[PDB]
């Protein structure tokens, strides 16, 4: 959910989930396999 704020700053409420699903000869060595991460927060950016 984005919106504006003083001096044209952009404030946002964020829910983010991302990542892979575990799937085990160097196959995992080549593929990304970056785990899973979810972050829920709210922040504003100039």
């Amino acid at each position: 959910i984005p919106r504006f704020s003083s001096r044209g700053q952009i404030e946002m409420s964020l829910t983010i989930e991302d990542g892979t699903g575990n799937s085990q000869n160097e196959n995992t060595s080549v593929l990304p396999e970056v785990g899973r991460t979810k972050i829920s927060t709210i922040a504003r950016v100039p």
Partner: peptide, 27 residues
């Protein structure tokens, strides 16, 4: 005698929000 007005909030959201704390829900 009466006034109808529009106020433009900047630094906050207007609608009440809900957050989950894995058991202690916060409004």
């Amino acid at each position: 005698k009466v006034n109808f007005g529009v106020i433009k909030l900047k630094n906050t959201f207007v609608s009440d929000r809900t957050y989950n704390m894995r058991g202690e829900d916060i409004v």
